[PDB]
Amino acid sequence: PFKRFVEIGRVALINYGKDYGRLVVIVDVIDQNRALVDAPDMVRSQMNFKRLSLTDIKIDIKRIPKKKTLVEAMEAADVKTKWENSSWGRKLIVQKRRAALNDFDRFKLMLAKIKRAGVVRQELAKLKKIAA
Amino acid sequence: AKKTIRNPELIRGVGKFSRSKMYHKKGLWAIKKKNGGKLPLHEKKPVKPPKFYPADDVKKPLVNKHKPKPTKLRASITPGTVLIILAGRFKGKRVVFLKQLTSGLLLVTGPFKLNGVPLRRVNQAYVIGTSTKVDVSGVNVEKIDDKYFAKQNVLPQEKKDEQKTVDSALLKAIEGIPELKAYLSARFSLKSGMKPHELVF
Amino acid sequence: VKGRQGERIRLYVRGTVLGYKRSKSNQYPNTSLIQIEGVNTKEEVDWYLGKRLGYIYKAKTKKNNSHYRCIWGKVCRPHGNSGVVRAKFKSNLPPKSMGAKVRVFMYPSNI
Amino acid sequence: VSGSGISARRIVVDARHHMLGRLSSILAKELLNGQRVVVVRCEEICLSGGLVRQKMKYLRFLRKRMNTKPSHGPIHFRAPSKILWRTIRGMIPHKTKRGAAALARLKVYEGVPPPYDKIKRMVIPDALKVLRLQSGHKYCLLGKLSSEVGWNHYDTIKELENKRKERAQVAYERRKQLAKLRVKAEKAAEEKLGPQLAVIEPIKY
Amino acid sequence: VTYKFHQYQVVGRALPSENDEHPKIYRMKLWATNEVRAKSKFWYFLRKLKKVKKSNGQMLAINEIFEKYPTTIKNYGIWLRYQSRTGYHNMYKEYRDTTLNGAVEQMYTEMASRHRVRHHCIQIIKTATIPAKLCKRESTKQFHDSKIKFPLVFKKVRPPSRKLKTTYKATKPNLFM
RNA sequence: AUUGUGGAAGGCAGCGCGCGCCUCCGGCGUGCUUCGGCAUCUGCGCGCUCCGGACGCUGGCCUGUGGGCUCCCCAUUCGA
Ligand SMILES: [K+]
Ligand SMILES: [K+]
Ligand SMILES: [K+]
Ligand SMILES: [Mg+2]
Ligand SMILES: [Mg+2]
Prior knowledge:
The structure is cut from a larger assembly and holds chains A (about 130 residues), B (about 200 residues), C (about 110 residues), D (about 200 residues) and E (about 180 residues).
Chain A: E1 6-7, E2 10-14, E3 23-29, E4 34-39, E5 42-48, E6 52-58, H1 67-77, H2 79-85, H3 87-99, H4 103-129
Antiparallel strand pairs in A: 2-3, 2-6, 3-4, 4-5
Helix pairs in contact in A: 2-3
Chain B: E1 9-11, E2 14-15, H1 19-26, H2 28-34, E3 81-85, E4 94-100, E5 106-109, H3 112-115, E6 120-122, E7 127-133, H4 157-176, H5 180-185
Antiparallel strand pairs in B: 1-2, 3-4, 3-7, 4-5, 5-6
Chain D: E1 11-14, H1 20-32, E2 37-40, E3 46-48, H2 51-63, H3 80-89, H4 97-104, E4 106-108, H5 129-132, E5 139-141, H6 142-148, H7 154-192, H8 195-200
Parallel strand pairs in D: 1-2, 2-4
Antiparallel strand pairs in D: 3-5
Chain B binds one RNA strand of 80 nucleotides through strand 2, helix 1 and helix 2.
């Protein structure tokens, strides 16, 4: 039993190219290798499945819907909120945040991590002597 | 007399107004009237015996019309910017940028109290300008210049006091920003997996 | 804590000396091919263009009270599509340096 | 293939389910760039085309021998580790000093003998079978091929590997429990660390 | 945005003469990689079909034809004539694409693959947009399903860019459909 | 990124400031104009510049374990 299928309404992540990190909706299937994808901020276009990673999100739309119909369907299912709140979608956001930290911000994070590690190690020692 | 330039430049070497427009703005038409319908004509602006004669005629180099221009200041570097030194004995230390001297070098301070870097000149090519800014409005370095770092060993007490006067005004600003004192007291370094071309400063 | 003894600050990245500019049948020692750790594309190479390079090695005799020798160079242009670069040094690197490491400094700085 | 370009004192590679030729070419380039490599579990390397084709190829290799003096080569090694070593030798200018030094930086073992049984082992995606061979196409393990051409230590490696895996499972459970004991420690430390967690929150996965 | 093959209408005629001051005007819909090659193939057919060579002919107009709705999916039928290693043959092919330019590109790629037919050994007789209910090839029919549903059986594992490429990794790829 | 060959010329070219006034990012006179503009008035003096081929600054070192080398032996990559 497979968990994810290519179908009309499936939300996919572009995993390669310039559009990497963007979410698109499969609105129609051309052939085994290509699908017709549409997003609120892009023109409807075809792309190969080799550049798509299917997600667990799936909106309820008909084949090749209008942009207004597509937009409301995504908002009704909270596609953006679900993706960003998910662990998979949060990974992409965190990677961008880490790369965007300046020198001063990295120094602050170092101090927080160093202090966090020191306290955690002390807590473990107590859990060792007591809960041996 | 005229208070502002008549012909602003769209680009380097090209004025905004044409010759016909400039003739009106120059006022040559008005000057012609005041001089009997003619543009006034002006006039062109009007040893010891040698002790040794060289056998070979001396050769003098041809004229070069190119004149050096002042060293430019990187856009990332602004007064109060925190700089990272990349070379020398102070490599890796984070200092505060004060101003650019006439020679084109940058005037920086540790401050000396936090990291032991005094008022020093650092070449712009050997520093990285970060995004951290510390207020230096209360810092007065008008007395400092290139001659202040010129040779003519014990450091005279006069310079030590001068360091403290500039330093004191800067400590209060640094103390205002949390964790900024420790930031300026630690050297920058590259750890495993740290790619300089991806780091944001 | 480790208790390590060594350089306390590293302001350079390591680069591997791969060889010289060459064809299938000719070699041009005046140019060297250097792979910079962490640089995997031609676009990323643009940041390192002009950066100073140092090839540090040990000689048997002492000069200026040290066995270390340094040959200076710099990054000139990218090579290929995978982040390799072409480098020139004050003197052509010896073939013995193939597989050795060089220090890619962060100066002269444009940022 | 230009090379990894990483700075490491030593690289330990687990060759399980790696394609022989693609693993060889990548490692050959790594060795030529001055990288020291250790390859473990060479008996689990995979060869495309299936056992029958690969067995026939090796038998053709066994035919090659100097008619007037067979001891003068070619030498037909049977063990998986030596077959991998000879495969890499064909992708290196081994008759030059540069090539000989590159080969001298390679070590190959069947199984995972000490001390490498307690050292992190990496994989090479460009040579992995799951990425290079389409499911349903023929392939054989190098250990199986070696056994049929005169390698008699397959059983010995099999028993030692089972013993190592069981010990590794015990160690894995100890770390697994130690991890459960550490999630409690951070929760207890949560009260103490109020400002620190706020800074790390946007960065935590 | 960019297509390997472009569709052009080429219009030409024989040079006016005393016997015929208004010679017949011929038009063709030709596929080529650019205008220059479209004109050359126009004179090829006029020379061999209407006996009008370029030396005694006149080029009137050349215009590129663009897909009307490049955002929707259409079924395209292509009637073609091609040369094999032993003679000439006719075949009809169907394709699904957003533009007829893509469908023609698929046709050339397929002919090269399944028949080893080079580009210059193919003549396109006719093209048309076929409605779903009039398609003949099963490769096109199976995608005429309102409830089209299938998994991605074969995935390509790779970093988003070569910036995140490393020779060594601590664990093998984790893949699941 | 590579490079400074020349050593007689302040030339050629394009501009700026003065030689007339104003409230000065601009304004003020003829001719033409597509009404935006225009080499139509645009001369002289003194200057500037992407303008008849690189100049400037700083440091190191100078009898040293320094510098240089076409000399010698050897090693390595390529060629043979
Ligand atoms: K230059
Ligand atoms: K000297
Ligand atoms: K030699
Ligand atoms: Mg290569
Ligand atoms: Mg000269």
